[PDB]
């Protein structure tokens, strides 16, 4: 449940935390004060949005590591009205960076990096994962909260 | 009752019992229909912290083995043949790096060799392995 927030500082404002935040549709204060601030655990951001999912309490299913040719793919088996966490690799990054994204009922994709405040919808989304330099990817659907 | 495959594999995993592991938790029900989901929801009440792994079939189940590291205790998510919902058993890969298998509902203990056998005669298609990462007991 939200508290009072100003989008906090430092590196609260890390991917997976923002990303986490929006997909439970919380802020990140909410996020510290409860859970606290996780560092980098084994030195993946798979393992620490997958271990900040598992103290929160998102149970998801998780697709593992693939080529960003063969997203839409994955994108297509998703299931209508669906929210999920996107970990990608990086050409100019050693960890990897999280997004969001959504299918809706009629089957469209939307993408939500929250750091950077972008958004990106269907026809729009080839351009970007090649704009971003994203390699391979790794998708994480929640089922419950 | 509680004498269920989920709850029998997390209390063997944590090294306890399940009427000491259910009075922490409480009786949690099936949880979205799901095994896979009851046990993720039954691990992150405990805090054993785990890597989810995507839903393979059996057949390709030994280079998922052969790519764990050493000294690893997991759950194992089964689809049935003849079951509506999944089946939970246990897993260790050793120092040495053998595969041992549990089935703490039906005490079953398996090892390498007898792994093709034994997932043949359980009628097990696909899979979906949970690999343990941290225990509190
Ligand atoms: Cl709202
Ligand atoms: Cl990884």
New interface residues.
């Given amino acids: 449940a939200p508290d009072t927030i100003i989008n906090t500082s430092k590196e609260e404002n890390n991917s997976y935390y923002c990303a986490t935040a929006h997909l439970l549709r919380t802020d990140v204060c909410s996020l510290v004060n409860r859970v606290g601030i996780e560092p980098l655990?084994?030195g993946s951001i798979?393992?620490t949005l997958?271990?900040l999912w598992?103290?929160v309490?998102i149970?998801?299913?998780?697709?593992?590591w693939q080529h960003v040719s063969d997203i839409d793919t994955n994108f297509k088996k998703l299931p209508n009205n669906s929210d999920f966490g996107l970990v990608f690799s990086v050409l100019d990054c050693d960890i990897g960076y999280v997004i969001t994204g959504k299918k809706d009922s009629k089957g469209n994709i939307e993408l939500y990096d929250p750091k950077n405040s972008l958004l990106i919808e269907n026809d729009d989304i080839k351009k970007y994962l090649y704009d971003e330099n994203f390699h391979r990817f790794c998708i994480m659907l929640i089922?419950?909260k």
């Fill in positions: 655990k084994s798979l393992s997958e271990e598992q103290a309490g149970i998801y299913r998780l697709y593992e089922i419950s």
